[PDB]
Amino acid sequence: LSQEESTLIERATATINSIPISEDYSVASAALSSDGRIFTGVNVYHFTGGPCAELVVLGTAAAAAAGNLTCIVAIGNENRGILSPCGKCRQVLLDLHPGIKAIVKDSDGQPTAVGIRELLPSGYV
Amino acid sequence: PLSQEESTLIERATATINSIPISEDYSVASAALSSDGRIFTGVNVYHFTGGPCAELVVLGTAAAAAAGNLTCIVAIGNENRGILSPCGKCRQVLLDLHPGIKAIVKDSDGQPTAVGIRELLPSGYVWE
Amino acid sequence: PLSQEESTLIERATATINSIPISEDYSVASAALSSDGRIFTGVNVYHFTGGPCAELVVLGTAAAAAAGNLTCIVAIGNENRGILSPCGKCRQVLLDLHPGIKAIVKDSDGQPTAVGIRELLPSGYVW
Amino acid sequence: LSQEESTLIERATATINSIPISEDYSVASAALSSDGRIFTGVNVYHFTGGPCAELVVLGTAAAAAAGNLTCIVAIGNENRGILSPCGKCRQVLLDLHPGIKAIVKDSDGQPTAVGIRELLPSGY
Ligand SMILES: C[As](C)(=O)[O-]
Ligand SMILES: C[As](C)(=O)[O-]
Ligand SMILES: C[As](C)(=O)[O-]
Ligand SMILES: C[As](C)(=O)[O-]
Ligand SMILES: [Cl-]
Numbered sequence: 001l002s003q004e005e006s007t008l009i010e011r012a013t014a015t016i017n018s019i020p021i022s023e024d025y026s027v028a029s030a031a032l033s034s035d036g037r038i039f040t041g042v043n044v045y046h047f048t049g050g051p052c053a054e055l056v057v058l059g060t061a062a063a064a065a066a067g068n069l070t071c072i073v074a075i076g077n078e079n080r081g082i083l084s085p086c087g088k089c090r091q092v093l094l095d096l097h098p099g100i101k102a103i104v105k106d107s108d109g110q111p112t113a114v115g116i117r118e119l120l121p122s123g124y125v
Numbered sequence: 126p127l128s129q130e131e132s133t134l135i136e137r138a139t140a141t142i143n144s145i146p147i148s149e150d151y152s153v154a155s156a157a158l159s160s161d162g163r164i165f166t167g168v169n170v171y172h173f174t175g176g177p178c179a180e181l182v183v184l185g186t187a188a189a190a191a192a193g194n195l196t197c198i199v200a201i202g203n204e205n206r207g208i209l210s211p212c213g214k215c216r217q218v219l220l221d222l223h224p225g226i227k228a229i230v231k232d233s234d235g236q237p238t239a240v241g242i243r244e245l246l247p248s249g250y251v252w253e
Numbered sequence: 254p255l256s257q258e259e260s261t262l263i264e265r266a267t268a269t270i271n272s273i274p275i276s277e278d279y280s281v282a283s284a285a286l287s288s289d290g291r292i293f294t295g296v297n298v299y300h301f302t303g304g305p306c307a308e309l310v311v312l313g314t315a316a317a318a319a320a321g322n323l324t325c326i327v328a329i330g331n332e333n334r335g336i337l338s339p340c341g342k343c344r345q346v347l348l349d350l351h352p353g354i355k356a357i358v359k360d361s362d363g364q365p366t367a368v369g370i371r372e373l374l375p376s377g378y379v380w
Numbered sequence: 381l382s383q384e385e386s387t388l389i390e391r392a393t394a395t396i397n398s399i400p401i402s403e404d405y406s407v408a409s410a411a412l413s414s415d416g417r418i419f420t421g422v423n424v425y426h427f428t429g430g431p432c433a434e435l436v437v438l439g440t441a442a443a444a445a446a447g448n449l450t451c452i453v454a455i456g457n458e459n460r461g462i463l464s465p466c467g468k469c470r471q472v473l474l475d476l477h478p479g480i481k482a483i484v485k486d487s488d489g490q491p492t493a494v495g496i497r498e499l500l501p502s503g504y
């Protein structure tokens with residue numbers, strides 16, 4: 001991982017570890033913008049489709065007029081570490097920030113940043 | 126009429142949606158008040174898979190800050206649409222996660238008014 | 254009191270959920286009535302990404318049958334939970350796609366009653 | 381594809397072509413259960429997360445106590461043909477029917493059945 005990738009992991013980790021343990025708010029995300037800012041958020045769990053942390057990040061970035069996001073990561077509570085984006089988040093990320101990379105674990109459990117398109121092969125169009 | 130703090134929510138959400146490019150994806154801003162005095166903002170993320178409304182982005186932003194219970198929320202539309210009542214999905218999430226919250230809606234006169242979330246979902250479904 | 258058709262909806266949704274294995278993923282059934290008199294049923298698909306409630310599965314089932322306008326809907330929970338009021342998300346989709354629809358809910362005395370969808374979303378969201 | 385798989389495409393195509401053209405009801409899906417039954421459905425578009433056709437199929441199959449679904453396909457209206465499942469559907473399919481395959485188009489535009497895990501690499 002690059003310096004900025006490690007930094008996103010640290011920011012997301014600090015975010016989730018800094019709030020009370022909760023079944024409603026259990027994952028944090030951090031993303032980097034092309035204009036030199038970092039946005040965080042936590043999920044809102046709900047059966048009607050409450051947003052993942054990544055989507056909260058996207059809305060937070062949009063509220064700040066941070067156009068292009070270039071890298072994103074999700075970190076689970078209780079020291080779970082890096083979580084790969086769920087399929088819903090992958091679709092929203094592909095559609096709204098097609099240039100973005102997401103930090104996921106490789107087969108060795110080692111963090112790596114992968115282009116969003118690679119996380120949705122034979123993508124829906 | 127509205128309390129001072131309630132008016133501040135309308136101001137803040139109006140500033141937010143007037144501070145971002147006009148967009149079909151990012152078209153509504155929201156602001157909520159915590160019992161701790163802080164205000165949290167958010168903009169929606171439109172998507173057919175169920176991208177969050179602005180209110181849900183606010184909820185996640187407040188949660189990220191370990192906010193004290195939220196007491197009031199408002200949504201403000203782009204293109205100068207003004208106050209928008211929360212959609213049914215947002216109403217359900219607010220009822221379930223912040224049952225004490227009020228939402229700012231327009232009365233009969235088009236005048237801002239704070240209403241308990243329960244009033245916005247009569248015979249409310251209870252997520253157990 | 255409910256019409257014959259409305260009672261039939263309750264019976265059909267109840268039969269549907271009672272007929273399947275108890276499950277955390279599939280835990281509510283719904284039945285709706287179309288203006289032409291047909292009945293469509295469905296069960297929910299629970300998922301954190303926003304899997305559909307039974308009502309929405311019923312909407313897609315009716316749509317697959319070119320059912321047109323739906324006039325009444327009800328949801329019934331598993332394990333003899335009985336009538337459940339539609340959640341806020343279902344209310345919004347129902348109002349938007351079938352504005353003429355009523356939902357069966359329990360009134361303040363616990364008695365089934367058919368209510369216009371608009372009444373279930375006061376000061377509703379309009380674009 | 382196998383003949384059972386080809387039938388899914390036929391059934392989903394018939395379903396979407398049988399209904400009035402609509403912006404709300406625009407995709408049909410068909411799935412095969414382990415015992416050979418076929419279940420169909422159409423989407424319900426809504427900004428709050430109305431279900432894709434696949435999820436309607438999942439609830440339809442569940443209503444019939446179908447158990448495991450082994451194959452699924454989505455067909456777009458207006459002769460759009462096979463549509464790869466979106467990321468949301470991929471996630472639900474993975475979680476509720478991990479043994480399932482989805483029919484997608486290959487490089488030559490020809491139908492191919494792919495395991496759901498391959499459609500969500502490094503899957504959550
Ligand atoms: C890694 As996730 C559950 O926030 O899509
Ligand atoms: C007023 As709304 C579309 O953010 O629920
Ligand atoms: C009564 As319901 C959880 O199907 O909206
Ligand atoms: C191919 As789709 C829009 O039903 O996931
Ligand atoms: Cl959703």
Ligand SMILES: [Zn+2]
Nearest residue numbers: 052085086089
């Ligand atoms: Zn996600």
Ligand SMILES: [Zn+2]
Nearest residue numbers: 178211212215
């Ligand atoms: Zn909403």
Ligand SMILES: [Zn+2]
Nearest residue numbers: 306339340343
């Ligand atoms: Zn519902």
Ligand SMILES: [Zn+2]
Nearest residue numbers: 432465466469
């Ligand atoms: Zn889909």
